[PDB]
Each structure stands twice: as structure tokens, then as C-alpha cells.
DNA sequence: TCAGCGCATGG
DNA sequence: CCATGGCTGA
């Protein structure tokens, strides 16, 4: 078992970890969106939208309107619909496949949902501090 | 390759 | 004020 550490950086994937979708929802909502804004619309989203069978089934303009002071709400709205269904549909392995999740979410998932963390090449700033201060404490780790 | 989605905040 | 905080469809 993986079971990603904390850092001093305090990313939200840090406590998303555990649940590959919740941490892929948090990506998501990180598009073109300072983590400041991000994080909190995020909880008041996941309270209302516990889980991809509850996202998958649900009104893409009700998820809109919670969207809107971020920015991209109805773009992130119906792609949040179609990713959670998606989700619970079909077959994946690597999550990128998925409507809505390139690069970043996938290499988040990559370091954190599983042990690829070693592999894995970060673009996103966030990830590449975590990635490199992987490198430095792993062994003071396991 | 690339427009386009989008409001908030900092320079 | 005009930058800047990923991804798809094309
Ligand atoms: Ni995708």
C-alpha cells in the first residue's frame, strides 16, 4: 500500500488521496482557478455531491450557478456530469480517458491514488514541489 | 496548433 | 487596464 505523505505545501490532494474521484474533482475545479477560490466551492460541492453515482445523475445547471464565482461554470458543470458518469460507467486504468481529466489530473492520480510517484514527470507547479520534496525525505520514509 | 471557456485578483 | 490562476473539440 502507497498511502501518499503530507507536505509542508498542503495540497488538496494530500486529503483527497483515498478517494480517486473526489481527488479528480479537485483538479478539475483547479482549471485555470487559483486554489484559493477552488478549495472552498470544492467541500460545499462534495457535501451536495458525495459521490460519482450522486454527480453522475444530477442537474448540470444546479451545479452551474455553484460554479459561477470561479469562473467556467457551465463548461465545468456539464463536464463534472459527464467525467462522474463516465466514472462509474466505463473501464479506465490511467483516468486521462476520462471527459474533462488530461495531464494533470492524471498525474496527480498517478502520485497519489497509486505508487507511480517515482515515474511520474509534473508540469503543474503545486505537483513539482511535492515531487521534488518527494525525492529528498522518501528515504527518512520508506 | 489553437481558440475558447470565465470570474478574481495581482501587477 | 491586461495578465494569469487545464482541457476539449476541431
Ligand atoms: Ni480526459
Same mark, same amino acid.
Given at each position: 500500500?502507497w498511502?501518499?505523505?503530507?507536505?509542508?505545501?498542503?495540497?488538496?490532494?494530500?486529503?483527497?488521496?483515498?478517494?480517486?474521484?473526489?481527488?479528480?474533482?479537485?483538479?478539475?475545479?483547479?482549471?485555470?482557478?487559483?486554489?484559493?477560490?477552488?478549495?472552498?466551492?470544492?467541500?460545499?460541492?462534495l457535501?451536495?455531491?458525495?459521490?460519482?453515482?450522486?454527480?453522475?445523475?444530477?442537474?448540470?445547471?444546479?451545479?452551474? %450557478?455553484?460554479? !459561477?464565482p470561479?469562473?467556467?461554470? =457551465?463548461?465545468?458543470?456539464?463536464?463534472?456530469? +459527464?467525467? $462522474?458518469?463516465?466514472?462509474?460507467?466505463?473501464?479506465?486504468?490511467?483516468?486521462?480517458?476520462?471527459?474533462?481529466?488530461?495531464?494533470?489530473?492524471?498525474?496527480?492520480?498517478?502520485?497519489?491514488?497509486?505508487?507511480?510517484?517515482?515515474?511520474?514527470?509534473? %508540469?503543474?507547479? !503545486?505537483?513539482?514541489?511535492?515531487? =521534488?520534496?518527494?525525492?529528498?525525505?522518501?528515504? +527518512?520514509? $520508506?
Amino acid at each position: 500500500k502507497w498511502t501518499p505523505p503530507r507536505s509542508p505545501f498542503n495540497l488538496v490532494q494530500e486529503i483527497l488521496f483515498h478517494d480517486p474521484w473526489k481527488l479528480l474533482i479537485a483538479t478539475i475545479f483547479l482549471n485555470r482557478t487559483s486554489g484559493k477560490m477552488a478549495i472552498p466551492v470544492l467541500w460545499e460541492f462534495l457535501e451536495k455531491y458525495p459521490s460519482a453515482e450522486v454527480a453522475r445523475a444530477a442537474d448540470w445547471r444546479d451545479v452551474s %450557478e455553484l460554479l !459561477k464565482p470561479l469562473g467556467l461554470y =457551465d463548461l465545468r458543470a456539464k463536464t463534472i456530469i +459527464k467525467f $462522474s458518469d463516465e466514472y462509474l460507467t466505463k473501464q479506465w486504468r490511467y483516468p486521462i480517458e476520462l471527459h474533462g481529466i488530461g495531464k494533470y489530473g492524471n498525474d496527480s492520480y498517478r502520485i497519489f491514488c497509486v505508487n507511480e510517484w517515482k515515474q511520474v514527470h509534473p %508540469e503543474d507547479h !503545486k505537483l513539482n514541489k511535492y515531487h =521534488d520534496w518527494l525525492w529528498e525525505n522518501h528515504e +527518512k520514509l $520508506s
